[PDB]
Symmetry: D3
Subunit: 275 residues, 6 copies
């Protein structure tokens, strides 16, 4: 296993990525190309939450895929998240394509993972990057690669839907109201989506994920949705690994099966080798 930490510059606003590369198993006769998952952590667009980076990355790596953690654009400074964050997701994917030979990467299996605030970036991208008109509008010309499916964990979907709380904050993320609501950007061309949240989420209302899923169904796009009956926002792995010390509110033993479900879902979609 190799760990790469790089700045990528092929975007208006350069960003940092941290890649976790799988090594080829030594006693194999033939070499295998592994899937790759790009992870966008949460952090309310003001930071990137460690809880939703390496603990999750490692979990997916255990199932035999490379992972890259993307440091998408934030509010810090006087900067806005959009459109820059979309340009960065595209750059990352493009960069992966250029790393396929060196690292055995199956470009037919690039997957996007989003959590809380990072879920907005992913959900929006799933809409924009699949629509020629919007690739042009949001400057994704000439970026190679395309993702195959997305995974949303307690995602922020509509900015008018509960998070954030004030019209100033919503516009600070973006003044582009076409990107405010990710479910309004779903078309049949959108890639399939594994979505989960808890019903008792309070900082990012469950309505967010639901509206997205509703949009995928109505546009006949393959989706799977797990709304667990309990648990706070930002459960991450929902177990001891991502549990803040002392605080039992970060433990949910039923939500904690989400990775197993997600992985099984990837297999169903033909995006991960099956047992």
């Amino acid at each position: 296993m190799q760990v790469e930490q790089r700045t990528l510059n092929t975007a208006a606003h350069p960003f940092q990525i941290t890649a976790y590369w799988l090594d080829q198993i030594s006693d194999f006769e033939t070499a295998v190309d592994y899937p790759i998952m790009i992870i966008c952590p949460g952090g309310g667009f003001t930071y990137h939450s460690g809880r939703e980076e390496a603990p999750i990355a490692t979990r997916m790596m255990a199932a035999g895929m490379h992972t890259v953690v993307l440091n998408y654009q934030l509010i810090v400074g006087d900067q806005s998240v959009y459109p820059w964050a979309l340009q960065q997701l595209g750059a990352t994917i493009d960069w992966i394509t250029t790393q396929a030979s060196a690292h055995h990467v199956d470009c037919q299996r690039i997957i996007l993972a989003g959590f809380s605030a990072g879920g907005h970036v992913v959900a929006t991208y799933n809409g924009v990057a699949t629509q020629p008109e919007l690739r042009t509008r949001y400057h994704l010309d000439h970026y190679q690669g395309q993702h195959a499916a997305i995974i949303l964990g307690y995602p922020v979907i509509d900015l008018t839907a509960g998070f954030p709380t004030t019209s100033a904050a919503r516009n600070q993320i973006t003044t582009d109201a076409r990107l405010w609501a990710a479910q309004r950007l779903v078309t049949p061309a959108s890639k399939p989506a594994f979505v989960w949240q808890t019903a008792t989420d309070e900082s990012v209302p469950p309505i967010n994920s639901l509206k997205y899923v509703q949009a995928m169904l109505q546009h006949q796009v393959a989706t799977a949705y797990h709304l667990f009956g309990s648990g706070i926002h930002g459960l991450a792995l929902a177990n001891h690994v991502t549990q803040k010390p002392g605080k039992d509110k970060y433990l949910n033993d039923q939500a904690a099966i989400w990775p197993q479900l997600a992985l099984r879902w990837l297999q169903e979609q033909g995006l991960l080798a099956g047992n």
Copy 2:
């Protein structure tokens, strides 16, 4: 996550280790000390099998523990495995103790994992390192640290028990017949053991693991034993990750739950935080 590849020299025969360090989660208020698992791959004492290194290491890392992969002494050259391999397991543990500050390592939770040939080294160590008389005999004086529990996956236990096949091969591993049979070295001081194998193992007869477990019970030492009804030798993770390309004989969906069992067992023993 950091990856360290080092030669350790505080043993008669220097060896290579590859350590996979957990990083502290950024948005924690207080820092946490994680458990650490040392992994001894299989390879019939002639090599170290990649299949039983990083795929397993990564799997355990996902449950929130550091891992170190130990390149124990091999037959290559005209060298023997013993006593040198025991000295190396002790050196590794000692070295970990010196790395605890830098990496947040819970020395009350050092765990040893063994697979096939690597299982012999571990099972033997669990006997020797816990017996003052044998620490002296096998030169473990002044090595700090002590492991807390061991995990054996389809282990080689008695060298007179099926593997290897010829009296020459057995002596090439070691001329020390006191180390030939790891179950004869079990005493109440032995640390607890999670053991698993398949009943249809042919290169290393199931009798090996059984005899060990039988010894642990009879010396009133806490143990757990999972003998799956089917599957070849060297299943590793028993899933797509460690499956040799094309060959379905490396897939066992029932044996594949061993990690989940093992981890739950570690929790029971108080050696891994519980959910």
Copy 3:
């Protein structure tokens, strides 16, 4: 000791930092959080002087603190230093806060060091970052962390005060005349300052430091000022380590005690453990 060389991107103009991390001492029972000092070298805003980077960094490290060397914005290109350099100092501090767990960093003890041209960036920041109105104006919204004290070595303070020599050069650094004079930005909210220079400085008149100190006193802010009676500009460590080969004009044995004074001053302010 670890050495990190990274581009940081959470600012309009991305920059390079070189961090020198202290490692936890192995034979300590409990872990300790160390202070951290950010160093801005001189170079007349056209380059970063090596003399004022690692030789100084190492000197402070010896007293038991992490150091980061910041490559603040320069005139090169057609670029200006301001406002970008202020955004970068804030980004660096913010980034440190996100590295505190991994490296044991005491965020109640972040310190800023400035030399010659780098002194302007620091002195200005000490004014801006402490004034809510100016954090907003100069785009420091949402940057975590705050420094505790600053250290100025032969600093450039007022751009109308001797350095640079022509009105073109002054405006090339910045057209923002509110940032021209760092002493006019001092308010009671400014953090404490250790200031030193030589009286015989010719490229950056001693008047610069003096005016700053005068402003700190008049706003009742804790400060300490050492104006050595002799020596050229850019003495750095004033000893053999930073002495240009052959040239004795870079040796001043009385100015060379500045680090000892500075460190003792940090102790007085409670920003460095005391003996």
Copy 4:
């Protein structure tokens, strides 16, 4: 030999460089300063071709010079190549000057290599960077260093001359028509040029290189030109090393002597030690 991979930020649009540093030979009594060659690969301004990076870099390293591979600005996004790419070539050179002590670099021997699309960037730079009026216009103020000679392999020279094929593509590279034709920017101040191409080039007509050479002659600048009678575009090393697997059209045994010619030419110009 050391390998460095860094983002450089002292330009409007930050870029990645990959440097291959020569190490000092251990059994030398005195240390030697080696030349350095900057390489701009081809890729039609949409990507950087691996074929024209390390295989070429390594080839030149064998003749005893450091190499740096520059990731010049691309069309990707909605970005244009110019003026940014010129700023980046200057930044790279400047950065090298700051690395001379650490790596023994002979700044009187910085050389620029260009291939296909990368040849345009180099050829243009050879014109701009040598003309005070154009350094000012294209923002190369305060960048230290200057190259000594350039090398063009099947270069794109005039954008109205065959590559690219549509007026949209030409303007997407740049709307600045003063940079469209690199031969119109040649003056006596231009540095000497080693130029080669194949006569049967179809994607970038041989006319391109010819027009450049013609301009160098007419301005009395030292140049050498090798137009091989056969071979496709993008032959690179023209041998097995850069040959796409299976495709014999990337093999030209006569064009394959270009490196030997180029190196001998560097010696003639006093830019590489001679045998």
Copy 5:
């Protein structure tokens, strides 16, 4: 290109290797496995000459092969070169086999290069490793891999043949007189050999190489021999790259074609792709 510096421990006397790995070219559709050359520098068994390491390594890398530089056992201490050095050559080869997946290495094309003192180690190995009786005697049991051809540059062949000068020195290298003369160990099973030297060699008489070649012919083993009419011992690359500063005696323009000859020879033997 990646650079690896590792201690290998699977030998009685652990040794350092420095590997220079080729990276897969990014714009290839299919991946290619490259040959690998192991280089044993000279140094009179008291040191390893830098002149015969990276300058040569890089030269071969340019022709599209990985290289590893082996730090074979030396006289330093009271240690002898043999048998340990043979064990180390075998370990290196074995280790390469375990690195083939990760680095695309063609194990049907492992090549050994020897210079001066390093030539003895190689020439001897070519005899021992190919003779079952001698693999057993010199402890090469269970080492995977086998080399395909060897390359000797001004090699030391018979220790009674001019180098070294005193019977004490000869025995300090080894008391094993069966290894004193490498030509007496040639049998039809020996791998093919490219040999070169200068006729005016004085520290290691030309007779050495000649006797070896004579042995290869008489055992009907494919060999090629280039005895250049002039030049001192230890010419290395014979050009400016390996020329000690000031001393023209390290320049031979006719001997300097040896790499081109050697590479062409590798192609003839089917051990390097041909143009």
Copy 6:
């Protein structure tokens, strides 16, 4: 500044070194060769104390010298310290000579530092390495380099003199009674020594250092001796940097000037540039 962590193998018992390399200052016209100090920490021959490694290393680096931390042989296993540790000190020095070109190292200024147990290794070496008869006896043949001076901090000198406490422990370190007493190995050929200790040392009686100094005087070898009137054993830097958390017994403000004295002493001896 670069940090190197390597195993060295040119000794019977391979060892780890951690080197801290000074980088050349960028804005120097000419390059300078720096001194290098090798540090042997304490630890009672059972471990290497972190307190006496990087905190001290960094302190000396601040005065403008490279440092290497040597992991000398320990009792761990059933191993003895001698003769192996002497072979390792010689190997380290030899290795440095081979690193001089790459890192600008002044081989006329190699210095050895010893603390507590590490002081024995140094003091003994200062005797052995300077006596042709003893280089032969203790196998230092063919190791290049030689140290210039040594520094002993609260050193263990005579093993019959207080440390260790039992005749078993003394022999476990070494059965070679010729190495038991380092002061009995002093001859005029011994290099100069800076020695310090506290008079109230209880685990290693002050008599140890005194006897050494007495031997240096009586053999007319230049020495300097600072016996501070108070303080425990293992004060290290005697300040907050090496102070175990909470325990004031590791603070001695008078002993804490030892580095300043030592450095000034190095200048007097011409082994460090003077101000």
